[PDB]
C-alpha cells in the first residue's frame, strides 16, 4: 500500500495497454528524446560541418532537402570521439554547426533500443513465455550498434558513423565499399544470404501455409474469416503442405515438424544478420574483404585481370572522389 | 528550391483519391447491420 510498492506494481503491470517495466523506465524517456530531436533536426537544423573542414553539409528540409536527400548529419571530424553534449557548446548555434544533434540522437537511441530488447525479455517473463524473442531482436540491434557506434570507435570519429538519412545511408555504403571492399567480405556475403534467404523463406512459409488453409468460407468471403482469433485448432493442414513441398524438392528436404520449421525461420535470418553486424564491426578495425588485385599473372608477368580487378577500378573511383577536400596526404588511413 | 509546379497537386491527389476510396468503403461497412 506504500507508494513505491504501488508504483512498482503499475510499472510491472501486465494490464497496461503498452507494457512499461523497468527497462521501459529507461526506454521511454531516451526514445522520446531521440525522436523529438530527430524530427526537429530533420525539419529545421542548419548545415553541419561533418568532415571538420568548415564545409557544412545541409541535411534539413527547410535548408533545401527533400525526403530522399535529407539527413541528420554526423558530428564534426574535429570532435572525433569526444563527448559533445549540449552543455559542452558555447551556444546552441555552435552546437548545431558542429553536429551536436547527431550525438544526442544516436546515444539516446542506442540506449533506448537496448532497453527495448531487455523489455522484450521482461514482458515474456511476466507472460509466462519462453524468453528468446529478444535474442532474435539482437540481430538488428547489433547492426545498429555497428554503424552508429563500433565503426566510429574503430575509425576514431563519429563523423564516420552512418548518417540519419536516406541518401546519407547510401554515402556511407559507397565509402565503406571503397575503404573495406565489403562486397568481398564473407560476413557481408553471409548477411546477404541471411536477408535474401529470409525473404525467400518468408515467401515460402507464407505461400505454403496459405496453400493449405482448410476450407471454412464461401466463394464470396475472404478466406481470412475462416480463422478465429484464439481458436484451438490449427487453421491449415501442415501434412498437405509438407506433402506438396517434399514433392517439389524431395521428401527429406521438407519440414513436417512445425517447431523445427519455425526454429529454422528464426535462425536463418538472425544468424546471417549477426554476421552482417560482425562484418561492419570487424571492418571497423580494418580487417577488410578479400583482396585479389593482380592475383592472376601470365608466364611473363603480365597481370591478367579478373572481375576482382574491375571491382578494384570502381572502388578507386569512389576512393579518390570521396570527401574531396579533406585529405592532404597520400594515404587514407582512417 | 525550383521544384516542379505539378508536384503539389500530384502528391495531393495521390494521397486523397485512394484514401477517400478506403474511407468510403470503411464507413459503409460500419453502417451495415
Amino acid at each position: 500500500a506504500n507508494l513505491w510498492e504501488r508504483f512498482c506494481n503499475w510499472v510491472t503491470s501486465t494490464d497496461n495497454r503498452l507494457y512499461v517495466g523497468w527497462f521501459g523506465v529507461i526506454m521511454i524517456p531516451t526514445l522520446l528524446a531521440a525522436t523529438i530531436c530527430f524530427v526537429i533536426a530533420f525539419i529545421a537544423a542548419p548545415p553541419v560541418d561533418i568532415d571538420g573542414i568548415r564545409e557544412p553539409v545541409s541535411g534539413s528540409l527547410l535548408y533545401g532537402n527533400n525526403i530522399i536527400t535529407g539527413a541528420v548529419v554526423p558530428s564534426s571530424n574535429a570532435i572525433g570521439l569526444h563527448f559533445y553534449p549540449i552543455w559542452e557548446a558555447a551556444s546552441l548555434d555552435e552546437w548545431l554547426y558542429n553536429g551536436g544533434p547527431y550525438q544526442l540522437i544516436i546515444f539516446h537511441f542506442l540506449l533506448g533500443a537496448s532497453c527495448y530488447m531487455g523489455r522484450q525479455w521482461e514482458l515474456s517473463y511476466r507472460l509466462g513465455m519462453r524468453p528468446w524473442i529478444c535474442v532474435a531482436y539482437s540481430a538488428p540491434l547489433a547492426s545498429a550498434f555497428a554503424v552508429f557506434l563500433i565503426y566510429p570507435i574503430g575509425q576514431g570519429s563519429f563523423s564516420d558513423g552512418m548518417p540519419l538519412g536516406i541518401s546519407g545511408t547510401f554515402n556511407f555504403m559507397i565509402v565503406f565499399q571503397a575503404e573495406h571492399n565489403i562486397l568481398m567480405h564473407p560476413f557481408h556475403q553471409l548477411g546477404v544470404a541471411g536477408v535474401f534467404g529470409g525473404a525467400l523463406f518468408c515467401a515460402m512459409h507464407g505461400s505454403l501455409v496459405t496453400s493449405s488453409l482448410i476450407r471454412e468460407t464461401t466463394e464470396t468471403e475472404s478466406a481470412n474469416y475462416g480463422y478465429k482469433f484464439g481458436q484451438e485448432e490449427e487453421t491449415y493442414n501442415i501434412v498437405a503442405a509438407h506433402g506438396y513441398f517434399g514433392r517439389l524438392i524431395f521428401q527429406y528436404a521438407s519440414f513436417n515438424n512445425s517447431r523445427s520449421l519455425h526454429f529454422f525461420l528464426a535462425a536463418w535470418p538472425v544468424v546471417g544478420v549477426w554476421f552482417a553486424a560482425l562484418g561492419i564491426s570487424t571492418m571497423a578495425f580494418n580487417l577488410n574483404g578479400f583482396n585479389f588485385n593482380h592475383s592472376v599473372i601470365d608466364a611473363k608477368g603480365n597481370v591478367i585481370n579478373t572481375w576482382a580487378d574491375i571491382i578494384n577500378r570502381a572502388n578507386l573511383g569512389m576512393e579518390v572522389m570521396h570527401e574531396r577536400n579533406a585529405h592532404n596526404f597520400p594515404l587514407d588511413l582512417a | 528550391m525550383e521544384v516542379n509546379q505539378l508536384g503539389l497537386i500530384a502528391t495531393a491527389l495521390f494521397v486523397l483519391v485512394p484514401s477517400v476510396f478506403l474511407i468510403i468503403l470503411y464507413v459503409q461497412t460500419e453502417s451495415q447491420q
Binding site: 495497454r17 503498452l18 527547410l62 527533400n66 478465429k228 482469433f229 484464439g230 | 521544384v3 503539389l8 495531393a12
Partner: peptide, 30 residues
Amino acid sequence: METITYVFIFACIIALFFFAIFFREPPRIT
C-alpha cells in the same frame, strides 16, 4: 510548399499510428 507537404504526410502517419494502436479493432476470442 514541399516542406509543408513532406511534414504533412509524416504528421498523418504519426496520427495513423495513434489510431491504429489505441483505436484498433479489439482482438476478441470467439
